[PDB]
Write a protein that binds this ligand. Sequence first.
Ligand SMILES: Cc1cc2nc3c(=O)[nH]c(=O)nc-3n(C[C@H](O)[C@H](O)[C@H](O)COP(=O)(O)OP(=O)(O)OC[C@H]3O[C@@H](n4cnc5c(N)ncnc54)[C@H](O)[C@@H]3O)c2cc1C
Ligand SMILES: Cc1cc2nc3c(=O)[nH]c(=O)nc-3n(C[C@H](O)[C@H](O)[C@H](O)COP(=O)(O)OP(=O)(O)OC[C@H]3O[C@@H](n4cnc5c(N)ncnc54)[C@H](O)[C@@H]3O)c2cc1C
Ligand SMILES: Cc1cc2nc3c(=O)[nH]c(=O)nc-3n(C[C@H](O)[C@H](O)[C@H](O)COP(=O)(O)OP(=O)(O)OC[C@H]3O[C@@H](n4cnc5c(N)ncnc54)[C@H](O)[C@@H]3O)c2cc1C
Ligand SMILES: [Hg+2]
Ligand SMILES: [Hg+2]
Ligand SMILES: [Hg+2]
Lengths: 267, 274, 275
Amino acid sequence: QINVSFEFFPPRTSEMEQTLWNSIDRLSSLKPKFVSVTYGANSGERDRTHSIIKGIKDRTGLEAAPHLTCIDATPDELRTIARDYWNNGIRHIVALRGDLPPYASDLVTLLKEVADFDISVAAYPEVHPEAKSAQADLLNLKRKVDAGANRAITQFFFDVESYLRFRDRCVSAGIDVEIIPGILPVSNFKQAKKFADMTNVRIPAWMAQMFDGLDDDAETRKLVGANIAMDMVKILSREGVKDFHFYTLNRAEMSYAICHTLGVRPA
Amino acid sequence: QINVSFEFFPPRTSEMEQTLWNSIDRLSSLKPKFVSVTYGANSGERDRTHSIIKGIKDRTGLEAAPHLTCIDATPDELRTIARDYWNNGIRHIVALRGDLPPGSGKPEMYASDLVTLLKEVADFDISVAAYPEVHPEAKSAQADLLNLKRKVDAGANRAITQFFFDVESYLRFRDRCVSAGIDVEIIPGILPVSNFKQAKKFADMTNVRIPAWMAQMFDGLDDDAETRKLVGANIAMDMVKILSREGVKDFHFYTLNRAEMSYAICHTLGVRPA
Amino acid sequence: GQINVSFEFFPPRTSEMEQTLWNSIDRLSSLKPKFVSVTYGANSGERDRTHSIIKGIKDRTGLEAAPHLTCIDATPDELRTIARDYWNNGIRHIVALRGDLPPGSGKPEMYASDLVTLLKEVADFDISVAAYPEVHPEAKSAQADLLNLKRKVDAGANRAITQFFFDVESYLRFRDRCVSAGIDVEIIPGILPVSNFKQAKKFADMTNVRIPAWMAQMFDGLDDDAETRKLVGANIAMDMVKILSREGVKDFHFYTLNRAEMSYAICHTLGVRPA
Ligand SMILES: Cc1cc2nc3c(=O)[nH]c(=O)nc-3n(C[C@H](O)[C@H](O)[C@H](O)COP(=O)(O)OP(=O)(O)OC[C@H]3O[C@@H](n4cnc5c(N)ncnc54)[C@H](O)[C@@H]3O)c2cc1C
Ligand SMILES: Cc1cc2nc3c(=O)[nH]c(=O)nc-3n(C[C@H](O)[C@H](O)[C@H](O)COP(=O)(O)OP(=O)(O)OC[C@H]3O[C@@H](n4cnc5c(N)ncnc54)[C@H](O)[C@@H]3O)c2cc1C
Ligand SMILES: Cc1cc2nc3c(=O)[nH]c(=O)nc-3n(C[C@H](O)[C@H](O)[C@H](O)COP(=O)(O)OP(=O)(O)OC[C@H]3O[C@@H](n4cnc5c(N)ncnc54)[C@H](O)[C@@H]3O)c2cc1C
Ligand SMILES: [Hg+2]
Ligand SMILES: [Hg+2]
Ligand SMILES: [Hg+2]
């Protein structure tokens, strides 16, 4: 069967707060394998990440996986955060290094020492913008797995071939874990392009065309974005992929629809 | 060169207050590397610790090191206290877990956690407790030794030992610290004994063994304070002499707010006024 | 006073050995040992005897009895059943060992740390494990063996009991290396009082334990002299135990070989007497 997960982020406004909880309720009915909440380098927000995971696990009963970054934190602190999480029933965590202020493998090992955690790590089909080469980054992923990562969630992508080729290189390199694709339903192209430029993610020429001229047409953008996303998962699904991780951005509709086309429906 | 330090406790009464300041004036002339003040569980020995430290600093200009306990303090309260000290020129703190009151027994925060917390605030000089005869609540002698290394690794500059009457206890313990990689000065704590009945009470509750020969020395002197002072001073002076011959260059005296005995012992140690 | 002692007995193989054992237990019980333990053999009969002697000790003396348990010839499920039964019967302290590998057809895949883990899953037992000041014969390195000890302690072991030794420096350096590896349990020295030297040499040869030249000299020529051997062996044991105590050791485990006199006397010099 198809397993899906949804990724949310801590809301920064009263409106965004309500929007989030509505989407959480709406998406819980699809029974995802788990849901994750992002974490950014900000003490108060770090507290917010905690509270949201707790609230989720407490009102839906779904498995909630918090993101944790190696950046700006001492090993003893990280260990206490881990023990505090495990103690609160939160046995799944997404281990990352973190966006640097103007390593991951170590955080994996750190967490495994504390407890037999279910760890998820980041994979880069188009190479992390910092690694010196495709191979170096590929080997790093392997290290993170060897350290104890159960799953590998990729950064969003638009070129299906880039992902399929990467997935092959992973197995060819001995990585025995699933490379769960990260899907970004695009409704705002302008914003998507900004994200891609940062993450080194390539936006194919054809996609640029699809959004050309839709700047003021919010409705058409959602229609075109959903179409593009549904095509993606259709191909990925036929190619053997049975696990999808959605970057909801606290919005339910597009992911809900895409899930419906995958057969992921309420029951 | 021999270095010394003296430990005082917050006076609860007017008479005790006077004795303390007299001792401070007497002992200050020896120019000790530092002087420290106890931090108990009650406000009497808690609020006062701060006052006495300010007093000492103003009246003599000697480095005063306050003792700090995490017992009934939130990490927030501890940081507040640490910032105040640092900002006011206090660069040395004696970080301790603290004597938990026999009632509630919660294995939560430990001294190493306090050390870490203090180092997050500023580059303090932290002194921690060491036990040559093992801390009475330790899992084992090895665990207690590992705890000392943990505190040194957390940022402790030096270790001050609990008092002892068997010089060999100190000597073996120091050898173990070195073999274990603990690279800081293991300052022996010296308790000049004037009253034996009171010394037995302290050692009893501290797991410190009192040799039979020492109990023999004070036997029959229950009402002879003058002879107890002479005998006790003799015992301390000999212990201190042995330790020096063995390489110890730093001593920490538990004055109990009384200056006479500690002053005399320091004199024979060669540490005298200018 | 502040010194704890424990005695180790093995299941007797004859009627004569049995009378000797119970006698030793009666005599040694007066010293109020922290606990007594009983060895675990490989054959079915022995293993049953271990259980009965532990029961006999518990009833007859009311002392804390700790049986040994190995991985040899047992499925994880047999082991759990045995452990559950032990716990329900009041015996809540086990000496967990992998066990002496028999010269037959069976490669070791399960080790002592695995047994500790399995035992911990059953109940909160007090678990004691084996330590080797002179390195276990099969260890590929002293580092491996020491890290293995840490592994067993991490799994749940409350204390370590070392293989016997004749060179105190070996115990002392090992006690130090244990701290350097982060092992936080007290390593209790295993004391083997020797009266029969040839037999002691046998045990040593097969355990990678070194007998100092001076010690061999001490027993040279005393083969047919049981009396002298007992005095010489007691003197040696007493000196070693004396040095250990001056070095801080306050816990001792005696390999009695079911005999009481030597361990009794050595205990007496430590100050552990009947009251
Ligand atoms: C599913 C997902 C979720 C994310 N969630 C968050 C989040 O909640 N918060 C957040 O801040 N960020 C998040 N990110 C972004 C991520 O933290 C950044 O891309 C960051 O730069 C890398 O984190 P990482 O775990 O991939 O780092 P790493 O795996 O450590 O790799 C990062 C870089 O280091 C390199 N590398 C690794 N080890 C070595 C080494 N020893 N020597 C040299 N180079 C080395 C790699 O090749 C690469 O260039 C997420 C990413 C993904 C895909
Ligand atoms: C120089 C000196 C000055 C002192 N001054 C004072 C004072 O001003 N005020 C006061 O109240 N008391 C004072 N004390 C006494 C001290 O607070 C008590 O001895 C207290 O019981 C332990 O303090 P500690 O700092 O040694 O704690 P710790 O170093 O934390 O050790 C306490 C115990 O816990 C164990 N332990 C440590 N970590 C762990 C762990 N993770 N798990 C389990 N066990 C662990 C240790 O082995 C030890 O048994 C002083 C002691 C000395 C020697
Ligand atoms: C106090 C004491 C009591 C004893 N009582 C008995 C008894 O009642 N019955 C009995 O049959 N025997 C007994 N013995 C002997 C003991 O069983 C043997 O010495 C045995 O060969 C190992 O037991 P162990 O528990 O040390 O094994 P372990 O701790 O598992 O180690 C045995 C060997 O395996 C190695 N090792 C550990 N883990 C691994 C790994 N994962 N991969 C590779 N090598 C590894 C160790 O380094 C060592 O060389 C006793 C020994 C002692 C010291
Ligand atoms: Hg980091
Ligand atoms: Hg505390
Ligand atoms: Hg086994």
